[PDB]
Amino acid sequence: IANQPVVIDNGSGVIKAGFAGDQIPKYCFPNYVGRPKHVRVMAGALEGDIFIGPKAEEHRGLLSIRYPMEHGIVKDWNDMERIWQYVYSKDQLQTFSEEHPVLLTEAPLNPRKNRERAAEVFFETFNVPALFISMQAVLSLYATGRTTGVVLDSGDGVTHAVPIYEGFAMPHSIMRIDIAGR
Amino acid sequence: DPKYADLPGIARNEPDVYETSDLPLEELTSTSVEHIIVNPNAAYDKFKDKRVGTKGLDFSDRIGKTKRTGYESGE
C-alpha cells in the first residue's frame, strides 16, 4: 500500500512543499527559525519559543531570525528537524510522515554527510516509508517538459549549472559556486 | 433654665444665634483618543486559560547564559 507522496523541496532560503500530482506548491514558507529576542512578561503572550512559517514573518521584530541551511549545506540539524516537523505540522500539511513518501531535493555536489543525516532524519525521526533524494536541474527540466537543456539555477545560497542532453546528465560538467541571493 | 432668676446679668430677649441666609469630567470626551470601556469580566474571560511557566527564570543582572527570557511555558 502507498499514498500520494510529499514533495519536500528544500532550499537555502525558501522551503517549498505540497503533495504530488498538484500544480501549485500550496505551502511555501521561508526556511528560517525565529525565536524571541526580548523577555516575555505578560500572561497571554505568544507561546512556543520557536516560530517557523508565516507567524515568523508576522512577528519579525520580535524574533531573532537565523537560517539553518547555509550554501546548501545544513548547518543546524535540530532546527531542520523543527522545520520539517512544521512541514508536517497542523498548519501546512496536517498529515503523518508515516503515511507518505518523500521527494527531497538537494543541490549537486553536496557533502555526503548531508545525505546520510537526511536519511537518518527521515528514517529515524520521521518514520517515512520511502525517500528519494533528487537533483534540482532535472526537476526543472521536468517542469518545463523538455528533455535537453543547461539548467542554470540560482537559489538563495547556491548557483550551479548542470548540462543535460536528451535526458542524460553529465556529472563531470557540473559547476557550483556558493555565491547567490543570500 | 433657672440661670435667669439666680443670676443678675443673664438677660432675656437674646437672639442666641446671629446668622446669615444659608444660600444654596469634560476631558474624556476628546476626539483625539479612543475612549475604551474597561470590562474586567471580558478581560478575565480572555485571559482565563493562559498559563505561565516559571521554570528556572531570572530577571536580575546575572550574566551566565546568552539571553534571558522569563516566563517560558504556558498551556
Side-chain angles (χ1 to χ4, degrees), chain A, chain B residues 1-74:
Chain A
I1 189 166
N3 299 112
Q4 193 170 3
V6 179
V7 181
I8 300 171
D9 188 2
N10 275 321
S12 58
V14 175
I15 168 171
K16 278 83 71 176
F19 297 103
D22 298 330
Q23 297 179 358
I24 303 166
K26 306 296 286 184
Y27 300 100
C28 300
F29 63 97
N31 201 3
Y32 68 74
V33 171
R35 56 193 64 190
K37 300 178 183 178
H38 308 294
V39 188
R40 186 181 295 116
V41 174
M42 196 181 174
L46 293 179
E47 185 70 29
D49 293 332
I50 292 171
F51 295 98
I52 316 104
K55 288 185 181 180
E57 292 175 352
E58 187 179 1
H59 313 296
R60 290 187 181 93
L62 192 149
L63 304 176
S64 72
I65 290 168
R66 57 177 296 161
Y67 294 95
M69 192 170 179
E70 291 183 354
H71 300 290
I73 297 171
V74 167
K75 300 296 192 295
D76 291 334
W77 288 103
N78 291 318
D79 293 329
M80 287 302 285
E81 286 183 353
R82 268 78 166 177
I83 291 165
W84 285 338
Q85 283 178 353
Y86 183 81
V87 173
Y88 290 110
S89 176
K90 292 181 180 180
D91 290 345
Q92 302 298 108
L93 289 177
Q94 302 175 357
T95 62
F96 292 160
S97 68
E98 299 178 353
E99 294 178 354
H100 292 281
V102 178
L103 172 54
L104 194 70
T105 60
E106 283 185 352
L109 300 178
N110 277 323
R112 290 182 184 177
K113 290 182 181 180
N114 283 321
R115 300 174 65 91
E116 297 174 355
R117 186 63 177 167
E120 287 187 355
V121 168
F122 284 96
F123 281 111
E124 287 181 353
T125 64
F126 300 97
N127 293 319
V128 172
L131 168 62
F132 172 69
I133 297 169
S134 69
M135 288 297 108
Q136 295 184 356
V138 186
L139 271 68
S140 71
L141 281 181
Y142 279 121
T144 58
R146 293 184 180 184
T147 59
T148 76
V150 174
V151 177
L152 189 269
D153 59 349
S154 293
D156 179 67
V158 167
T159 60
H160 61 268
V162 178
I164 295 167
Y165 179 73
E166 288 171 350
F168 290 8
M170 296 179 278
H172 295 92
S173 300
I174 295 173
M175 296 297 293
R176 177 188 189 269
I177 315 177
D178 300 337
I179 178 74
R182 179 181 293 174
Chain B
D1 197 5
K3 290 94 186 69
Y4 302 159
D6 294 331
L7 293 167
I10 307 304
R12 292 180 181 90
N13 295 319
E14 301 176 355
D16 288 332
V17 174
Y18 289 97
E19 66 184 3
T20 68
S21 67
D22 197 0
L23 294 175
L25 205 283
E26 289 294 326
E27 301 87 6
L28 300 178
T29 65
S30 67
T31 184
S32 68
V33 309
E34 296 181 356
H35 56 276
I36 297 173
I37 297 97
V38 52
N39 190 3
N41 195 2
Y44 182 74
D45 289 330
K46 188 182 266 78
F47 302 105
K48 177 69 170 65
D49 299 332
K50 290 177 179 180
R51 291 185 182 180
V52 168
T54 67
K55 180 66 70 177
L57 81 160
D58 278 322
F59 285 112
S60 175
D61 295 332
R62 184 170 293 161
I63 316 103
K65 275 78 177 177
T66 300
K67 64 180 74 173
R68 187 64 47 76
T69 302
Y71 295 164
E72 49 180 5
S73 176

